[PDB]
Ligand binder design. Structure first.
Ligand SMILES: [Ca+2]
Ligand SMILES: [Co+2]
Ligand code: NI
Ligand code: NI
Ligand SMILES: [Zn+2]
Length: 234
C-alpha cells in the first residue's frame, strides 16, 4: 500500500509505478499549434543503489525531465540506459543521456541504423546469440535486465527486456495491447517475420504476467497473443 497509484504528472511527462522498483515513463510527441500526440512508454528500474533506464523520451528536453523526476523521486544515480530500436520515440533523447554521463547501450544493428534514422547512436553495442539472448559480455552489470532480441518485427533491430525478480516483461514497440486496432507505425516493419518475433518474445519470458509496451498501457499476456494474431494477417 506504499506505492502511489495511477498516473503522476511531472510537467508534460507521466509516471506510473508498476512494481516496488519499476516505473513506466510516458512522453508525447509535441507539435507546435496542434498539441501532443503518440504517447510512448519506457521503463525506470531501481537496482539497489542505482537506476537503470529503458528507452528515452521523444526529445532531449523531455529525456532531461525524466532525469529530473528520477533525482526528485528516487535520488539515486542513473548508471545506464538500454534503448530498444532506432526510432525517435526510443532514441530521441540520446544526447540528454550522454550529457548526464549515463552509459548507453543498444542492439549493434540499432547503432548502425541510427544515423540513417536521424538518431544519435548509443555508446555501446549489444550482440545476440542465434537463439536471441544477449551475449553476456556485451551487457555488463545489467542487474535485473534480461535482454532478448526476438527477431525482426516492428523494425529489424527491435529488442525486448525482462525484469528479473518481477512479473514484468517489456515488449517495446513490438507488442500492442489486447484491444489495439492496429500495430501502429509499420513503415519499417518485417511483415513476414513479425508474428514469429512476437511469439518468440512471449516464449523468452514465459512467466511474465505484466506486459509493458510503448504505445499501449500495461496488459496481460493476451497482448502477446493479440499482437501475433494481428501480425499473422500481414
Ligand atoms: Ca539530440
Ligand atoms: Co525508417
Ligand atoms: Ni564504455
Ligand atoms: Ni482485437
Ligand atoms: Zn519504432
Amino acid at each position: 500500500g506504499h506505492m502511489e497509484t495511477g498516473d503522476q504528472r511531472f510537467g508534460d511527462l507521466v509516471f506510473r509505478q508498476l512494481a516496488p522498483n519499476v516505473w513506466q515513463h510516458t512522453s508525447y510527441l509535441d507539435m507546435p499549434g496542434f498539441g501532443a500526440v503518440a504517447p510512448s512508454n519506457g521503463l525506470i528500474v531501481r537496482d539497489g543503489g542505482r537506476v537503470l533506464v529503458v528507452d528515452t523520451a521523444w526529445t532531449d528536453d523531455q529525456t532531461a525531465q525524466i532525469l529530473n523526476w528520477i533525482k526528485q523521486e528516487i535520488n539515486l544515480p542513473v548508471a545506464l540506459a538500454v534503448v530498444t530500436h532506432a526510432h525517435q520515440d526510443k532514441m530521441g533523447g540520446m544526447d540528454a543521456l550522454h550529457a548526464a554521463g549515463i552509459a548507453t547501450y543498444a542492439n549493434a544493428l540499432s547503432n548502425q541504423l541510427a544515423p540513417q534514422e536521424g538518431m544519435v547512436a548509443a555508446q555501446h553495442s549489444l550482440t545476440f546469440a542465434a537463439n536471441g539472448w544477449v551475449e553476456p559480455a556485451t551487457a555488463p552489470n545489467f542487474g535485473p535486465l534480461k535482454v532478448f532480441y526476438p527477431g525482426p518485427g516492428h523494425t529489424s533491430d527491435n529488442i525486448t527486456v525482462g525484469i528479473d525478480g518481477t512479473d514484468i516483461a517489456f515488449g517495446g514497440c513490438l507488442i500492442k495491447d489486447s484491444k489495439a486496432k492496429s500495430l501502429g507505425n509499420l513503415g519499417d516493419a518485417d511483415t513476414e517475420h513479425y508474428a514469429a518475433s512476437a511469439r518468440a518474445f512471449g516464449a523468452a519470458f514465459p512467466k511474465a504476467s505484466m506486459i509493458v509496451m510503448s504505445h499501449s498501457a500495461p496488459d496481460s499476456r493476451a497482448a502477446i497473443t493479440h499482437t501475433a494474431r494481428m501480425a499473422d494477417k500481414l
